[PDB]
Amino acid sequence: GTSCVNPPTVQNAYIVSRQMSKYPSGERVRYQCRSPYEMFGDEEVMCLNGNWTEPPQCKDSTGKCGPPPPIDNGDITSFPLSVYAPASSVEYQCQNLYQLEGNKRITCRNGQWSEPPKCLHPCVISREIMENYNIALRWTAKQKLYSRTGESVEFVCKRGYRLSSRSHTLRTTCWDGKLEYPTCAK
């Protein structure tokens, strides 16, 4: 219960202590930054009862940033340079049906990018599940096969069924692929 695995990945650094698959509590992992990066924080990261202590960073001493980080199901809306001046910004776009969460723009400050956004998954609305659970969509308006993250999806029991005594509610919010279905019974 108190050993650790997977020492933190530190960009522009390598580990110079001996690597192993499981680190006992108390083991110290030592990082070194690649030239010409400057280290910030402690060069050693210890395993304390299953959690690592805080890792260092290896940054450009003039505050420049490297390429912006990739994000799942999204991409930047410009050519990715190898080097950005401090205060430069870039922006992201999510793929079709994905929902951007957080600021679409990131900025290079103090040698690191501000937090990029996420692209959250749409939810499948399964015909087969609905059939099996005796439910349908309340608004048969266009053929919505998917909901977007953040959208309410409302179902009804099919003609002649009522909500099963332990069912989820008939209205639920799609979130990052998660849709809770209700069930109805004769």
Numbering used by the authors: 1045 to 1230
Relevant lines from the article:
Complement factor H (FH), a 155-kDa soluble glycoprotein abundant in human plasma, is an important regulator of the complement system, the chief molecular component of innate immunity. FH is a member of the regulators of complement activation (RCA) family that are characterized by possession of repeating compact domains, known as complement control protein modules (CCPs), sushi domains or short consensus repeats. Human FH binds to, and regulates levels of, the first activation-specific cleavage product of complement component C3, C3b. The four FH amino-terminal CCPs (1–4) perform co-factor and C3bBb decay-accelerating activities, while the two carboxyl-terminal CCPs also bind C3b but additionally bind to GAGs.
In this study we describe the crystal structure of the three carboxyl-terminal CCP modules of human FH (CCPs 18–20) at a resolution of 1.8 Å together with analysis of this region in solution by small angle X-ray scattering (SAXS). While the long axes of CCPs 19 and 20 are approximately aligned, with only a ∼32° tilt relative to one another, the long axis of CCP 18 is strongly tilted, by ∼122° with respect to the long axis of CCP 19, and by ∼151° with respect to CCP 20. The short (three-residue) linker between CCPs 19 and 20 (i.e. between the last cysteine of CCP 19 and the first of CCP 20) along with numerous inter-modular contacts imposes an approximately linear rod-like structure on this (GAG/C3b-binding) part of the molecule; the longer (six-residue) 18–19 linker permits a sharp kink to form in the molecule, also stabilized by inter-modular and module-to-linker interactions, but with a smaller inter-modular interface than observed between modules 19 and 20. Atomic distances consistent with hydrogen bond formation are observed between Gln1101 (CCP 18)-Gln1156 (CCP 19); Lys1103 (linker)-Asn1154 (CCP 19); and Lys1103 (linker)-Gln1156 (CCP 19). Furthermore, the surface area buried between CCPs 18 and 19 is only ∼400 Å, compared to almost ∼700 Å for CCPs 19 and 20. Interestingly, though, the experimentally derived scattering curves did not fit well to data back-calculated from the ‘J’-shaped crystal structure (discrepancy χ = 2.4); nor did ab initio low-resolution shape envelopes generated using the program DAMMIF demonstrate the same acute angle between CCPs 18 and 19. The SAXS data were fit well by an ensemble in which the 19–20 linker was fixed (χ = 1.3), but were fit poorly by the ensemble in which the 18–19 linker was fixed (χ = 2.4). Taking these data together, it appears that modules 19 and 20 are rigidly aligned such that their rod-like conformation is independent of the addition of CCP 18 or the presence of ligands.
